[PDB]
Homo-oligomer: A and B are copies of this chain.
Amino acid sequence: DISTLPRVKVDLVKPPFVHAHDQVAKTGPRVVEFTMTIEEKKLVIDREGTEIHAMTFNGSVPGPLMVVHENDYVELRLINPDTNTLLHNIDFHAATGALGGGALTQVNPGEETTLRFKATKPGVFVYHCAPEGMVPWHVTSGMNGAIMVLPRDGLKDEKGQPLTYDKIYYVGEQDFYVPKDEAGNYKKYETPGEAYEDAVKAMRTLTPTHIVFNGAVGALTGDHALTAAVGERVLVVHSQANRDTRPHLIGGHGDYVWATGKFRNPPDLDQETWLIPGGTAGAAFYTFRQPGVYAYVNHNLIEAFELGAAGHFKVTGEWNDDLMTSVVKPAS
């Protein structure tokens, strides 16, 4: 009887940050209420000024990370304002039935809908738009995110002991397919609908023009680099709704990794690089041991350094010479 359960309303935050939550559940099962507003918007995705018409949940690419516990109910109010132009919906990979909710959430501009599902399987999971006949166009225009369903007793290592993170970040990785003219220059369009047949052609090459974290080349750098301190335990949730990726922390490891993101399985230990298949979210746990700049990349290094799939961590603290040291500095 869902009417007797507590309701809690969560206000979402912009990636790569994640809304406040408890790791170990401090209440019984709840109905967790979220609201998302769909926003079609122009986005500049690279240093050259290339512009696309992005399709977003809550204004960002990726959409925000939702966090619940196993056997909570997720109730999402999804709003498609009349300032948009397309029909949208939502498919949660966490959910069971009706194409993950997709069959029940088709909203034209000026409509809203409220969906409820029970979060029966713990893990991180992708969610994405999936309108009949235009599924890859919406997804590859940015209309995807993830949801984390924590076990009620939090995360566990390969021996069943508790793993507690101090910080959590969400990296959404996006493959874009910007149409090109004859000579290879990117095309601009005034409306999303203009791009349609050119988008289909660009997608069928299976070759992205850009692969980015958090919606743009260089988004997780400079003032927007991820931060941590030596000794901190960090969980990085990484999703890719359409195409395989292989995350790597340059200068670190994945101490505990759930590459396909499902927490009833034991983690893989000591990973250098891990494969997250397209249509999946994964999670990696690392304890920082050295200060400085780290790069977090898709380790197809062309995809990283030429197409955009690279961000930075900036880590403060004390250097440990026992782990690494320069014995003789570069000299002639």
A116: interface (CB < 8 Å): yes
Chain A 99-143 against B: per-residue CB contact (8 Å), 1 yes, 0 no?
111111111101111111110111101100010000110011000
For A135, the chain B residues whose CB sits under 8 A away are: 301, 304-305
Interface contact B270-A264, CB-CB below 8 Å: yes
For A273, the chain B residues whose CB sits under 8 A away are: 93, 126, 260, 277-280
A262: interface (CB < 8 Å): yes
Interface contact A115-B306, CB-CB below 8 Å: no
Most buried by B among A77, A295, A323: A323
Name which residue of chain B comes closest to A202, CB basis.
B302
A206: interface (CB < 8 Å): yes
For A269, the chain B residues whose CB sits under 8 A away are: 262, 264-265
Interface contact B293-A99, CB-CB below 8 Å: yes
Interface contact B99-A251, CB-CB below 8 Å: yes
Interface size on A, residues (CB 8 A): 102
A18: interface (CB < 8 Å): no
Expressed in whole angstroms, the Cα–Cα distance for A203 and B116 within the complex equals 46
Identical copies of this chain, number: 3
Partner of A244, one of B77, B246, B264: B246
Expressed in whole angstroms, the Cα–Cα distance for A175 and B276 within the complex equals 21
Take A103-B292, A306-B136 as given contacts and tell me if A243 and B300 are in contact as well, using a CB distance cutoff of 8 Å: yes
Take A205-B207, A290-B98 as given contacts and tell me if A116 and B327 are in contact as well, using a CB distance cutoff of 8 Å: yes
For A305, the chain B residues whose CB sits under 8 A away are: 135-136
For A280, the chain B residues whose CB sits under 8 A away are: 246, 272-273, 299
Partner of A118, one of B300, B322, B329, B332: B322
Expressed in whole angstroms, the Cα–Cα distance for A64 and B70 within the complex equals 40
Give, as a whole number of angstroms, the nearest-CB distance from A277 to chain B: 4
Interface contact B270-A206, CB-CB below 8 Å: no
Expressed in whole angstroms, the Cα–Cα distance for A123 and B269 within the complex equals 10
Chain A contact residues, CB within 8 Å of chain B: 75, 77, 91, 93-108, 110-118, 120-123, 125-126, 130, 135-136, 139-140, 200, 203-208, 241-244, 246, 248, 250-253, 260-262, 264-265, 268-275, 277-281, 289-290, 292-295, 299-307, 319-320, 322-332
